[PDB]
Design a protein around this ligand. Structure first.
Ligand SMILES: Cc1ncc(COP(=O)(O)O)c(C)c1O
Ligand SMILES: Cc1ncc(COP(=O)(O)O)c(C)c1O
Ligand SMILES: Cc1ncc(COP(=O)(O)O)c(C)c1O
Ligand SMILES: Cc1ncc(COP(=O)(O)O)c(C)c1O
Lengths: 454, 454, 463, 455
């Protein structure tokens, strides 16, 4: 066998792909082989399912390229990267109205993503709860966590750390965690409540303030003092700029910690998350580990150890070049696209909207389902497939709880998906509808849910 | 205030370094500002403390640059990256003699580094142990883990997952976990034993074979069946090439899982780890989460979620271009440098070596201390400072346990630190000794341990 | 009660500034200037909507990427092919290429020092030039015989659209032998039935666009010899070797289709196809000076003497010619043979593997002696696997592949075929992946019977 | 035996076996370096003042072209966005030339490789429209002719390739262009159309369509013969719309059925871009349009070429977007200022008669002059041209055709990149050349070879 690229004896990556290669290969050949098959990956420009950054900025490529070997954990060898990281933590803390540091540094850390950030927040929540119950002479064998339609990372947290997950079910007419059902699930064993400030499946905000009021009333009626951790994976970098009046952060006494994804609306490249604590008291010191350096010793609360510092640096770049002024315009642009799509899509079929891209209701997303008892001659799964033939990935999937019978389509509007592209989407959307109308036999055939976790 | 680079009003990164920036800034100015202060970071070429890759390969830079937005978790949009990842898992499994897969795919996963890989391995160990104790209706709230001079990630595991850490103390003449002391620490609550195949502090291997025999005798005498997880962060990509005869992997029945760092001797860029399980039985399905995609559901056992796929791609590039043939030559080269330094350094002072860079004893490292009761006229702390003035970072620190009075110097030889550089280090080493000899007052002044964790 | 902080103007999320739409007023010439880098990023971003064709198995055009070719093209962006004066070296390289192509096709040794031929933008222009020369030669004959040159016709088989254009644009009656069950190509018998005194020439297609098969000029050549013997009518040929011209000379030297045949007066082929050159390169060679009527050649003055030219286009980039030369130099016969063979191996593999998956009748199986590296098949007559090739094609698109399904012409206007093209870059590993997706598609069609018959639109087949 | 000093290895000659297809292969990086090194023998054209084609370098254009190397212009299916951008360009150029508003929203026209193909297409459409008006009237369609002035060679090629009698009004002292009177004298019932050249290749002057249009209206009034026009605005098409909007030469004139122009000339696009627009659907005989199938339905195409790169269209769009009318006006005016400056400055150096002085109202940014009849300054423009070449400049000296055969002119083209600073350097070298010819009289009359003048 020969290879038409190299004009020589073929080298297959498939052949013995299950055994460690025995011989050396020319470097440039290995590179070209891998480079060529990476073309099979999509570029996500037409993928409207993910929240993760997919746009390309030359300066970010340069900063990442320069940081390939900078080790985030090695404060000693990379002092400047460590300094930039500390600045970011303070800036994010400031953004969320965290109390002014009693020293000079906010309590928090950078992470690989919201998953780790949530685990750290969850562990701290569990430890604070354990300390309290112990100080009351009560048991700590059956901890539980109250939440709404959370992302899979919380299911993982509950499973990995043995905490009963009390997830309020999504239901027709009540898809999110409301004050009433939240309280019904709370007790002395509840380590905390986790509102999701930007639900993954729909894009809506679960508002912490009303929930906070209910928890105040709860402590008043029972003496049970319950705190909150806000999972603001997406909303944490949206509301502070486009909807400052929504009180969801550290302005609320019970909010002990907050986490968010830098690689989502934080605009950072893949591999960046943040978790901030209200103050030192909010973070049990037993979870922090002190490691020595020539410059002294620094404490860290992290699951990972060695890793690249490039994303942190790129995140700092976004903070510096944009500021509140810049983020407000960037985020607003996405909301305008989402709002436009929602209004335009509503004129094309019998739809019921769950999220319409309004800044006061959630993130830049459009989420809808077909109206109950309405048959346009296709399902959202069918429409989703027609759109794929046009290059778009618009996820169609079912909701959980008793809403398992609810099929929705969610469209995410992130940086790069400008108004001109949304108009193209609408063109293909209409073309797909006409095709489905001209070929009725297509209805009901497609029935596989698309990736919806991120 | 003006800036001499831009010839315009000064823009400080320190002034408002604790608040989120208010205004926008020209993108390129923000880039140059950050680019300029990153020069304050070292390049680590003269840093002989870390195990992490610090050499630069143009092809790796290109692959990483192309992968900046490729999401490791999104199998749907990046199918080829996911396929390459699967190949790597199988190749690493093959490298460690894992039993041939039933379905065709080995059981394991890529990780951010060895920390995450060890957590996963640790959780699986805890779960397998629990499933046994639970069947016998015994308490499962006081699990313990037996190990030697482990890296900090195991202390974190113990703390975060409430497992008693039974670390055999480092002591004069017995710095590692031996069969006798290991058994003395084992009981029905031991979830497993963790040998460190390449101790972080010294570079020596803890040999699993003798420990394995002791565990066989243990089960024979008590009925208690204890398994092992090999922390081969560094050794996992060394012995298979330069010392195939050392039996430390899956060839041993009790070894249920193994973890290693790709960004160490695996030659991958920062942000790559690996953990492999012997077979399906070794990994409790309760820990695996299944997520749906268009092409079907894929299960995952990971702490992190969204993150970049570049390192895995880069790792595959190393596997392809080198093979066993290439890795053997690369690792041998490092061992030759280490062996050379050990031999040469021994001629310069009254030293007792703990590791001399021998392939059959450990990793490419040199570790020594001053002979007991010997006073050359300086401490290794003093020598370390002298070498810093020459641009080298050669860590001097104390050991734990009873060897708390012992101060050692550890030199790590990784790719890029060639024979010519070792010669220069020897020159500076001699120069340092002469200076210390001509300036006696320096003795005893330096007393701060250097970063030793990685 | 408001809680937001909004701006009252459409914004762009990339630039954090007022939005600039390319769709708004995209029907009027822009009025104002715009920052250069912004215009660049705006265009760069929408170009991501284009496919990269790596998974497109319909085209014959080069889609692989070679760094050196990128550099040569980048350096030649302003080099004008027609300006021999300012770009002497590009002109020299072009002359070398003409000679090398002429040599490759066994053209008679130049009666001076340079072969008769020219580079073109593609096979279309090359064919037009060959067609005009053919018409002119024929006209000169009839006029010498005192006959009317009022009704010229051209005999051919299932030619590519460029010949339909030539016939239309130069008023030549196109006598295309119909594609039919049992015989989809131009055979000697039907060819002769279409020939007469007004036939300007015959155009065999050495690598049919629609199927990939070669129309063999030798048997046709014999028939034309017999024809002149029985009627005195002397008819010549122009070989449309768009794809085959850079295949057979390397993997099947024994096939006599070129200038080795007396009647072959000119040949054309595409450099940007199997010639391996980047888009925008074609070639047409004539047997000798006599084969090219000087009335079609235009002489322009240059600072160092006047050079003759026979082309439709004038000013244009010389980069593709340079890149073509680079392929000739780095590969040679030795290299082209290996590159082409690699594609044949992939095609042959797919044909053999695909045959095991359904009731198919193959028209082309990627054999070097029969045609180009392509696989062409249809469902066996009176066989119903539970899907049409159109349905299969759509399922493959959902997996990212573009495998064209379309109908044949003539009496085969009712037959639907699927054609797979194997060009440089589509290596064995990718063919395996295609097979995996092919099988997955079949299982899906099997589990979802309602899909059968829904898809009914032909894919782009002309190139 | 023979070695190469670059590779320190056996020599690899491109001259040896340069007429025979190479037999063996060689290292790719060696093949690249060998070709890269001889390409240095090509000029960079920065000092070439003969061509109209773009020669300046813009980094963004290099990037767009590099990204487009494999984008196939004809493959609408695989490259949808490239096709969309192309449609926008057609509409924008149509709007630029005042084409009537489309009935369906899309203007009638197409991108081409250059003005040559654009002119062929325009010419075929002209021939077809004339033929049909003829067949519908039951007349003979076998003797067509085309009336024009000092046309570029592409029209001679069209005439020859499509069997149309070319009636070119001869260039003559005093009246080097096609005037209304001589145009009419050449028109008849077999005239498929008139082709004014809005920017004559040889001189740079505009042939004004308006006066010719009036004569054609009177012609139809007196004879009933209705003749249309195709404007060859290869260079002028991207000049007058910005610096001289008041000149009526485009679709504002009823008889102008089609217009063609070069994007790679003053359109500022890279080599390989042309444009041809038709007034409306009726102006383009559908018999010439071919419809091909593709998943999205079917698209009609009228072009001689088929597969080709879409990079130039994309680059052309980039110029349209970044400049707009505002930008083009400033860019074009800058070239006119240089031309006007050179004309006025050169006039002070010798006994010259100017035929083009770079005035926006008269033509393109070019300077064209000849020596005053009988004035012998002691050299010919051929001699001057050679002296300028020794200083690195290529300033073409050549003879006019028709009845202007005795005339030797020098033409200077001012395109983007040739700024005022460079013009001053040219003037310095021009003066130095004059002084040298003055001090070395024996040089007079020696040079006598015309330079490339077609493009
Ligand atoms: C609410 C929410 N939390 C957590 C995550 C996981 O974040 P990451 O992928 O960065 O771990 C997501 C995607 C999310 O939408
Ligand atoms: C034995 C050992 N285990 C684990 C680690 C941590 O690995 P990582 O920094 O890649 O998480 C190190 C550095 C080590 O030396
Ligand atoms: C047989 C045949 N001839 C001519 C052409 C046209 O070639 P080009 O697109 O290069 O003009 C093609 C595509 C073809 O397949
Ligand atoms: C008036 C005129 N028409 C046509 C052309 C031919 O243009 P192209 O070289 O771009 O085919 C030129 C150079 C010209 O000056």
């Amino acid at each position: 066998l020969l290879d038409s690229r190299f004009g020589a004896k073929s080298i297959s990556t498939i052949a013995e792909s299950k055994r460690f290669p025995l011989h050396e290969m020319r470097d440039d050949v290995a590179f070209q082989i891998i480079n060529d098959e990476l073309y099979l990956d999509g570029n996500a420009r037409q993928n409207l399912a993910t929240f993760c950054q997919t746009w390309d900025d030359e300066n970010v490529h340069k900063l990442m390229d320069l940081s390939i070997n900078k080790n985030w954990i090695d404060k000693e060898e990379y002092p400047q990267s460590a300094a930039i990281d500390l600045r970011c933590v303070n800036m994010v803390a400031d953004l969320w109205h965290a109390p002014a540091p009693k020293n000079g540094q906010a309590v928090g850390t950078n992470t690989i993503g919201s998953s780790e950030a949530c685990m750290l927040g969850g562990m701290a929540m569990k430890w604070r709860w354990r300390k309290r119950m112990e100080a009351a002479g009560k048991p700590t064998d059956k901890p539980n966590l109250v939440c709404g339609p959370v992302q899979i990372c919380w299911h993982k947290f509950a499973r990995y750390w043995d905490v009963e997950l009390r997830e309020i079910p999504m239901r027709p007419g009540q898809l999110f965690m409301d004050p009433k059902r939240m309280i019904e699930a709370c007790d002395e064993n509840t380590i905390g409540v986790v509102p999701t400030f930007g639900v993954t499946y729909t894009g809506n905000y679960e508002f912490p303030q009303p929930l906070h009021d209910a928890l105040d009333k709860f402590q008043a009626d029972t003496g049970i003092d319950i705190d909150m951790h806000i999972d603001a994976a997406s909303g944490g970098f949206l509301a502070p700029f486009v909807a400052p009046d929504i009180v969801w952060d550290f302005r609320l006494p019970r909010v002990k910690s907050i986490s968010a994804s830098g690689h989502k609306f934080g605009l950072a490249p893949l591999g960046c998350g943040w978790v901030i604590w209200r103050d030192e008291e909010a973070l049990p010191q037993e979870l922090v580990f002190n490691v020595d350096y020539l410059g002294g010793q620094i404490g860290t609360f992290a699951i990972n150890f060695s890793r690249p510092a490039g994303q942190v640096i790129a995140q700092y770049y976004e903070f510096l070049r944009l500021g509140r002024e810049g983020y407000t315009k960037v985020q607003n642009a996405s909301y305008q696209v989402a709002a436009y799509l929602a209004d335009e899509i509503a004129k094309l079929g019998p739809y019921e909207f769950i999220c319409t891209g309004r800044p006061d209701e959630g993130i830049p997303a459009v989420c809808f389902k077909l109206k109950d008892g309405e048959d346009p001659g296709y399902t959202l799964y069918d429409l989703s497939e027609r759109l794929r033939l046009r290059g778009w990935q618009v996820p169609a999937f079912t909701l959980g709880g008793e809403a398992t019978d609810i099929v929705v389509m969610r469209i995410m509007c992130r940086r790069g998906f400008e108004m001109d592209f949304a108009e193209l989407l609408l063109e293909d959307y209409k073309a797909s509808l006409k095709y489905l109308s001209d070929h009725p036999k297509l209805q009901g055939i497609a029935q596989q849910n698309s990736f919806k976790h991120t």
